[PDB]
C-alpha cells in the first residue's frame, strides 16, 4: 500500500508543475521527503488537499 | 663527465642587509671544490639542487620537480610560467599558478617547510664552470607545500647538490657577498671560520676536536632461549 | 690546532692533533 | 549552479578580505561556524572553498552542521566539525521567471544520506518499490531530481535564495589565503612602537643613507641586532636608533 501512496503524492506534484503552481508542487515535495522516512499516511491527504485548492 | 665547482653556488641566505661584516651561517650550500655532474634525464633532488648552464641559443627553457614523475617551470619567450598540477608529459619543450658559450646562468633550488626557493645569477662568459666568485639572489618563493625528490631539466648544464655546511660570508660596504669560506674545506678554512676572518695571523689556533669514530656495533645478551610467559599473565582464565 | 704562518706569506698549514698517537688519526710524533 | 550539482570555486594565493561580504548588508544570513565573523580578517588558511548553490527560502536553515533534510542530506551536506562562514540572500527579483524558472534542480528521492562535501551528479532512475526499473520511469520509478519552479509571486519560503558556503582548510601549510592586514602611517624623528611585516621593536626612525639590495627588507649590526628597515610601501630605507635612555 505504501508504494501506491508514494506514487500518488508524486503524480500530484507532477500535475502541480504542469498547472503552473510551483509553490504547491514545492509544498508537496516536502510531503514526499517526509513520507519516505515515516509510516504517517496522512501526508497523502495533504497532497490531495493541496491539489484540490489549486484545481 | 664531471667538473670542478670551484667556489660557486653561494647565495644570499636571507633578506638581511649587512655591510662591511663577516657573517657565519649554516645553510644548504654547494660545498667548495665539490664534484658536479656535467651534462653536455631525471635526476635526484636530495636536499636541494645547484643548477647551472651555459648557453649559445637559450636551449634550456625549464624544469620539472616532484616525486612520481609535480610543478613545472617554463621560460616560454618572455614570461616565465609556473604551475603545480598533475601532468601527463621523455618530456620536452592545481592549487598554485604564477606568471612573471656566451652566457652563464646559475640557479639554486631548495625546498624548506613547503617553500620552494629559487635563487639565481646571470653573467657573460667567453669549457666548464668558470673559476671566480659571485652570489645568487632570491627571485622566486613558491608557497606550495609540495614534496620534491627528483627533477628533470627541459630543453650544456651542471648539477650539484647542497649540503648543511657552515660558510663565512664577507659582505662589502654596499651589502653584497664578495667572498666566502667553506668551513669544512680544509684546516686553513676552519681557522678562518673560527677566527671569523679572511686573514690569519702567524700562530697556532685551536679550531676543532678530533674524535676516533666507532666502526661496528657490538651487542651482547646472555644465553636466553625461552620466551616470557606473558600469555599466563594477560590471557589467564582467572585473576 | 692549526699551525700557520700568516696568510700574507703562505697558505700552507700544519695540523696538530693534541694528545693522540699518530696511528689513530710529513707525520711527526 | 544547481544545488544537486553544486559548484566549487577554489580561493587561494590571495587576500581574504571578509569585510567586503560581512559589511555589505546585502545578505540575509551571515552565519559563521567555529570563528567569530568579526575575527576572520585576522586569520590565515591553507585554502578557502566557495560552494555555490540555489535553494528555496525554507531550506536556508538546512545549510549548517548537524542539520538534516532533503538538502542537508541529499544535495549539499556539511560536517559536524565544519569550519567556515555561510552566507545567503534573497534573489526573488533575479532568479525567478514568469511561469516559473525550472532551470535549477535538487534531488528529492535518494537511497542514503550524503557524506560531507559529496557531490552526486547522477541521473539514474531511483527505485522506490520492490521491483527493478530497468531504466524505465513509471510506477515506483522516479528520476531522482526535481526542478525548483521559482516564480516571482511565490511566498518567501518558496522564493529562491543564493547560498555560498565558505569552507576553511586549516592544516599545516604555507599560508596561501590571509585576511586584509592593513597599514597605519609612518612616524619619523620620534620614539615609536613599530611593526614592519613582523619586524618589531621600539625606537626612533630616521631617513637613512644606506642602500639595500633589491631583495633585502631589513638590516643588522655585528651584534645581530636590527639597525635599519625598508618601508614596505615606499621602499625607502630608514635607520632605527635606540629610544633614548640613560641614568640620572
Ligand atoms: C669526481 O669523481 C671521479 C671518480 O668517480 C673523479 O675521477 C673525478 O676527478 C672527480 N671530479 C671532481 C671535480 O672532483
Ligand atoms: C607562455 O605560455 C602561457 C601558457 O601557459 C601563455 O599564456 C603566455 O602568453 C606565454 N608567454 C608568451 C610571452 O608568449
Ligand atoms: C613528504 O614525504 C614525507 C616522508 O619523507 C611524508 O611523511 C610527508 O607526508 C610527505 N608530504 C607530502 C606533502 O607529500
Ligand atoms: C657602491 O655603489 C656605488 C654606486 O652607487 C659605487 O660607486 C661604489 O663603488 C660601490 N661600492 C662598492 C664597495 O662596491
Ligand atoms: C591472547 O590471545 C590472542 C589471540 O590468540 C593473541 O593474539 C594475544 O597475543 C594473546 N596475548 C598474549 C599476552 O599472549
Ligand atoms: C701584507 O700584504 C700587503 C698587501 O695587501 C703587502 O703589501 C705587505 O708587504 C704584506 N706584509 C708582509 C709582512 O708580507
Ligand atoms: C703509539 O703506539 C705504538 C704501538 O703501535 C707504541 O709503540 C708507541 O710508543 C705509541 N706512541 C705514543 C706516543 O703513545
Ligand atoms: C604605494 O601606494 C600608493 C597609492 O596609495 C602609490 O602612489 C605608491 O606609488 C605605491 N608605492 C610603490 C612603491 O609603488
Residue nearest to atom 4 of ligand 2 (CA): B81
3-state secondary structure of B207: coil
Cβ proximity of B10 and B163 under 8 Å? no
DSSP assignment of chain B equals -EEE--S---B--SSEE--SEEEEEEEEEPPTT-EEEEE--EEE-TT-EEEEEEESS----EEEEES---EEEEEETTEEEEEES----------EEEE---EEEEEEEEEETTEEEEEEEEEE----SPS----BEEEEEEE-----SEEEEE--EEEEE-EEEEEEEEE-TTS-EEEEEETTS-HHHHHHHHTT-SS--SEEE------PPP-S---------S----HHHHS-S--
Could you tell me the CA-to-CA distances from D52 to B162, D95, D164 in Å, in that order? 46, 14, 5
* CA D72/CA D114 separation, integer angstroms: 8
Residue from D176, D47, D199, D49 nearest B142 by CA: D176
The C-alpha cell that represents B120 in the structure block: 639565481
DSSP state letter for A9: H
DSSP state letter for D125: P
Cβ-Cβ contacts under 8 Å for B144 (sequence gap 6 or more): B71, B84, B95, B96, B114, B115, B116, D174
Cβ proximity of B96 and B142 under 8 Å? yes
Residues from chain D that touch B145, judged by Cβ atoms under 8 A, are 46, 173-174
Q: Which chains touch B (3 or more CB pairs under 8 A)?
A: C, D
Decide: residue D27, CB within 10 A, 0-12 exposed, 13-18 middle, 19+ buried: middle
Cβ proximity of D237 and D230 under 8 Å? yes
Resolution in A: 2.7
Q: Smallest Cβ distance to B21: which of D213, D216, D222?
A: D222
Q: Which chains touch D (3 or more CB pairs under 8 A)?
A: A, B
* CA D175/CA D173 separation, integer angstroms: 6
* CA B181/CA B170 separation, integer angstroms: 9
* Terminal-residue alpha carbon distance, chain C: 15
Q: Smallest Cβ distance to D218: which of B17, B19, B114?
A: B17
DSSP state letter for A6: H
- D43 forms beta bridges with none
* CA D47/CA D35 separation, integer angstroms: 16
Q: Which helix (H) or strand (E) holds A47?
A: helix A42-54
Cβ proximity of D152 and D97 under 8 Å? yes
- B96 forms beta bridges with B84
Quick one: angle between helices A22-35 and A42-54, nearest 10? 170
Cβ proximity of A2 and D140 under 8 Å? no
Residue found under cell 652563464: B104
At CA B73, angle to CA B68 and CA B78, rounded to 5?
160
* CA B40/CA B38 separation, integer angstroms: 6
Domains of chain B and CATH, by start = 2-211 (2.60.120.960)
Q: Smallest Cβ distance to D219: which of B17, B115, B139?
A: B17
Residue from A29, A33, A23 nearest A53 by CA: A23
Residue B226, Cβ neighbours under 10 Å: how many?
A: 5
The C-alpha cell that represents D31 in the structure block: 552565519
| Backbone φ and ψ of B190, nearest 5° | -60, -40
Rg of the Cα atoms in chain B = 24
Residue nearest to atom 4 of ligand 7 (CA): C23
Residue B235 falls in which region: left (phi positive, over 0), alpha (psi -120 to 50) or beta: alpha
> Is the CB of B68 within 6 Å of ligand 5?
no
Residue from D126, D155, D120, D153 nearest D2 by CA: D120
Edge-to-edge, what's the strand order for the sheet holding C2-4? Answer: B203-205, C2-4, C14-15
* Terminal-residue alpha carbon distance, chain A: 26
Ligand 5 centroid to B44 CA: how many Å?
A: 45
**What is the experimental method?**
cryo-EM
The C-alpha cell that represents B70 in the structure block: 609535480
Residues 1-55 of A with CB under 8 A from D: 3, 6-7, 10, 13, 17, 20, 22-23, 25-27, 29-30, 32-33, 36
Amino acid at each position: 500500500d505504501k508504494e501506491w501512496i508514494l506514487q500518488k503524492i508524486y503524480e500530484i506534484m507532477r500535475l502541480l508543475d504542469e498547472l503552473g503552481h510551483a509553490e504547491a508542487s514545492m509544498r508537496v515535495s516536502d510531503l514526499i521527503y517526509e513520507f519516505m522516512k515515516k509510516g504517517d499516511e496522512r501526508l497523502l491527504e495533504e497532497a490531495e488537499r493541496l491539489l484540490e485548492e489549486v484545481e | 663527465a664531471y667538473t670542478n665547482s670551484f667556489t660557486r653556488g653561494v647565495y644570499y641566505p636571507d633578506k638581511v642587509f649587512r655591510s662591511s661584516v663577516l657573517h657565519s651561517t649554516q645553510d644548504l650550500f654547494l660545498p667548495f671544490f665539490s664534484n658536479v655532474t656535467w651534462f653536455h634525464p631525471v635526476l635526484p633532488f636530495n636536499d636541494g639542487v645547484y643548477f647551472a648552464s651555459t648557453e649559445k641559443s637559450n636551449i634550456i627553457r625549464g624544469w620539472i620537480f616532484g616525486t612520481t614523475l609535480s610543478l613545472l617551470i617554463v621560460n616560454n619567450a618572455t614570461n616565465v610560467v609556473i604551475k603545480v598540477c598533475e601532468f601527463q608529459f621523455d618530456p620536452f619543450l592545481c592549487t598554485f599558478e604564477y606568471v612573471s658559450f656566451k652566457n652563464l646562468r646559475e640557479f639554486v633550488f631548495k625546498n624548506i617547510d613547503g617553500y620552494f626557493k629559487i635563487y639565481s645569477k646571470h653573467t657573460p662568459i667567453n669549457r666548464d664552470l668558470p673559476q671566480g666568485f659571485s652570489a645568487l639572489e632570491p627571485l622566486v618563493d613558491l608557497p606550495i607545500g609540495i614534496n620534491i625528490t627528483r627533477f628533470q631539466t627541459l630543453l650544456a648544464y651542471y648539477v650539484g647538490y647542497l649540503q648543511p655546511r657552515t660558510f663565512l660570508l664577507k659582505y662589502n660596504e654596499n651589502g653584497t657577498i664578495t667572498d666566502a669560506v667553506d668551513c669544512a674545506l680544509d684546516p686553513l678554512s676552519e681557522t678562518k671560520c673560527t677566527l671569523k676572518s679572511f686573514t690569519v695571523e702567524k700562530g697556532i689556533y685551536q679550531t676543532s676536536n678530533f674524535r676516533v669514530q666507532p666502526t661496528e656495533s657490538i651487542v651482547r645478551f646472555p644465553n636466553i632461549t625461552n620466551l616470557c610467559p606473558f600469555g599466563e599473565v594477560f590471557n589467564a582464565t582467572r585473576f | 690546532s692549526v699551525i700557520t704562518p700568516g696568510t700574507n706569506t703562505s697558505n700552507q698549514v700544519a695540523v696538530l692533533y693534541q694528545d693522540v698517537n699518530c696511528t689513530e688519526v710529513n707525520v711527526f710524533q | 549552479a544547481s544545488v544537486y550539482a553544486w559548484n566549487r570555486k577554489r580561493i587561494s594565493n590571495c587576500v581574504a578580505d571578509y569585510s567586503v561580504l560581512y559589511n555589505s548588508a546585502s545578505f540575509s544570513t551571515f552565519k559563521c561556524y567555529g570563528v567569530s565573523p568579526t575575527k576572520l580578517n585576522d586569520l590565515c588558511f591553507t585554502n578557502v572553498y566557495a560552494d555555490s548553490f540555489v535553494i528555496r527560502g525554507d531550506e536556508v536553515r538546512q545549510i549548517a552542521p548537524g542539520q538534516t533534510g532533503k538538502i542537508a542530506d541529499y544535495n549539499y551536506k556539511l560536517p559536524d566539525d565544519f569550519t567556515g562562514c555561510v552566507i545567503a540572500w534573497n534573489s526573488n527579483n533575479l532568479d525567478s521567471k514568469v511561469g516559473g524558472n525550472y532551470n535549477y534542480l535538487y534531488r528529492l528521492f535518494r537511497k542514503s544520506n550524503l557524506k560531507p562535501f559529496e557531490r552526486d551528479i547522477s541521473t539514474e532512475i531511483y527505485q522506490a518499490g520492490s521491483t527493478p526499473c530497468n531504466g524505465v520511469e513509471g510506477f515506483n520509478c522516479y528520476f531522482p531530481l526535481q526542478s525548483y519552479g521559482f516564480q516571482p509571486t511565490n511566498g518567501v519560503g518558496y522564493q529562491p535564495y543564493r547560498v555560498v558556503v565558505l569552507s576553511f582548510e586549516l592544516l599545516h601549510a604555507p599560508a596561501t589565503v590571509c585576511g586584509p592586514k592593513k597599514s597605519t602611517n609612518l612616524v619619523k624623528n620620534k620614539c615609536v612602537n613599530f611593526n614592519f611585516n613582523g619586524l618589531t621593536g621600539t625606537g626612533v626612525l630616521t631617513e637613512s643613507n644606506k642602500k639595500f639590495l633589491p631583495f633585502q627588507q631589513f638590516g643588522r649590526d655585528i651584534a645581530d641586532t636590527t639597525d635599519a628597515v625598508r618601508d614596505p610601501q615606499t621602499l625607502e630605507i630608514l635607520d632605527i636608533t635606540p629610544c633614548s635612555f640613560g641614568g640620572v
